[model samples]
Target: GRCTKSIPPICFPDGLDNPRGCQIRIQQLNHCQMHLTSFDYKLRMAVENPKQQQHLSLCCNQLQEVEKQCQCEAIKQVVEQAQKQLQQGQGGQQQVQQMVKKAQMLPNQCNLQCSI
Candidate 1:
């Protein structure tokens, strides 16, 4: 049975400038909202590292919402969000790094360089 999970509301924290006037790209990252947060949390252990292949496609789909120019900003938010939300385990720091690597790779998998 696919039971229901308690979902939280989306709250964009204030502070991050739109990286010098970039708009909507900042807003659009949350278009994946729960998908993005739980995506990182599920991999927090780096254990399964299982290919939830469906989710990857979804992530890439969201990326297209913005121009390629916004790619870095998109992934940057993904990294910082992972850092704050998933920071707990003694190994948490390194775990977040791996999450970051995978976040960047989402672009690569989609054939967009999204170079940092």
Candidate 2:
């Protein structure tokens, strides 16, 4: 039997131009649950703003690259769960706090230094 762990959703900010930006966003998110919801709002705004779409797309691409390099299955699942939750219009501070811890651990686990 294959046992899988169900991790809390981790919010990854969109529209970051580079890995460093993703790192900084993730770092801020670690300490501030507010930023998690903020990032979610920005993503919704991007959907309405055509100009933001291109940037968001690039960020998504970069995220995919990072996911590939890090091979973090838990992170991937977290993102997917968050996406679903957002689509269903369900979000809470408790979830955000759980996500913050998970997001902060990714950099250290991957041996990456993020600069703001």
Candidate 3:
């Protein structure tokens, strides 16, 4: 049987400029659970501000590159989070953990190496 997994939420902050701003914002999401709905200046710069979009777009394009670099660690962290949630006795924790574990192994299985 195929195993199912949950894709964890990614958050971003506000402020900064251009590609750097976008990269920073994505990094925030990759690490911290920033609220997407909230008013984040860095996020705003990356997504809402058209003036910053040109550079931001370039930065956004590099997300895959950046993600490839950190994919393994990110997945490991998320798996840990899911395990914590399970340990806390939260509902659906098992499912979440399974999903995270599956995700964590993808890079290696696919022969795509990534850093945390």
Candidate 4:
């Protein structure tokens, strides 16, 4: 079932660095920041009105959880590829795989994040 999911041919969008996941991550981060700002307001509200804290806390926590899970799943794909090379043997593939794995493992602090 998973194999049926379409993997589009990778191409850089005009004026963009990478495609697919990078693009998606860019959007996700934007939304995440907006949610964080809302959460901050909620925290302030929570100090004055405890009742309002419930929904904002739930929304903020959900956004954060989804973000974390998305990141881990994306990285898992890259790690799987690296593990394949380890199984193969020492060589260029192995070296490249290691590099890829490291690249993917790095955190995305801003836009233009690359994968392994």
TM per candidate: 0.51, 0.26, 0.33, 0.25
> After superposing candidate 3, which stretches have Cα over 4 Å from the reference?
1-68, 89-97, 109-111, 114-116
Off by over 4 Å in 2: 1-88
Question: Candidate 2's residue-wise lDDT over 13-87, tens digit each?
Answer: 643333222232332222222333334545654436765444333333344455343324324334545445544
lDDT of each: 0.54, 0.40, 0.38, 0.38
Q: Tell me, what's the RMSD of every candidate?
A: 14.3, 15.0, 16.7, 15.8
List runs of model 1 lying over 4 Å from the truth: 1-20, 24-51, 88-91
Q: Write the per-residue lDDT of candidate 4 for residues 1-116, one digit (tens) a residue.
A: 01222476443345323223322233333333233223344345344676653443443333344334344343444344445544565444443443343324333321113333
Best by TM-score: 1
**Clash-forming residue pairs, model 1:** none
Q: Of 1 and 4, which scores higher on TM-score?
A: 1
Please provide, for model 3 over 50-114, each residue's C-alpha lDDT reduced to its tens digit, 9 standing for 90 to 100. Answer: 66334323322433344454434444444445455456664555444433454444445434454
Among these predicted structures, which one has the highest lDDT? 1
Residue 81: error of model 2 in Å? 10
Model 3: colliding residue pairs: 5-99, 11-29, 13-43, 14-40, 14-41, 14-42, 14-43, 15-41, 15-42, 69-115
Better of 2 and 4 by TM-score: 2
Instruction: After the best TM-score superposition of candidate 2, give how far the Cα of residue 94 lies from its true spot, in angstroms.
Output: 2.0
